[PDB]
């Protein structure tokens, strides 16, 4: 159904699923997630 | 999966899954989630 969400979740990231309004938000915020998920794994 | 993502997804709002590290950080974005929905769908 939703892939970003289905991806997290079978790799074990507990997730929040923020709505969007805007197109510029979406990118916006998918950039955020994107960013977060690098810090996240990183080494 | 996830009950929060598919719930938004059924009822047509795109979202962001937002990854948490801190249970109070999960509780505080949850709360943050609820807010957002209820000014969207506010009348």
Request: glycine share 2%; charged share 20%; hydrophobic share 50%.
């Amino acid at each position: 159904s939703i892939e970003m969400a289905h991806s997290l979740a079978q790799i074990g990231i507990r997730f929040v699923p923020i709505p969007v309004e805007t197109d510029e938000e979406f990118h916006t915020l998918a950039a955020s997630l994107s960013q977060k998920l690098e810090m996240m794994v990183a080494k």
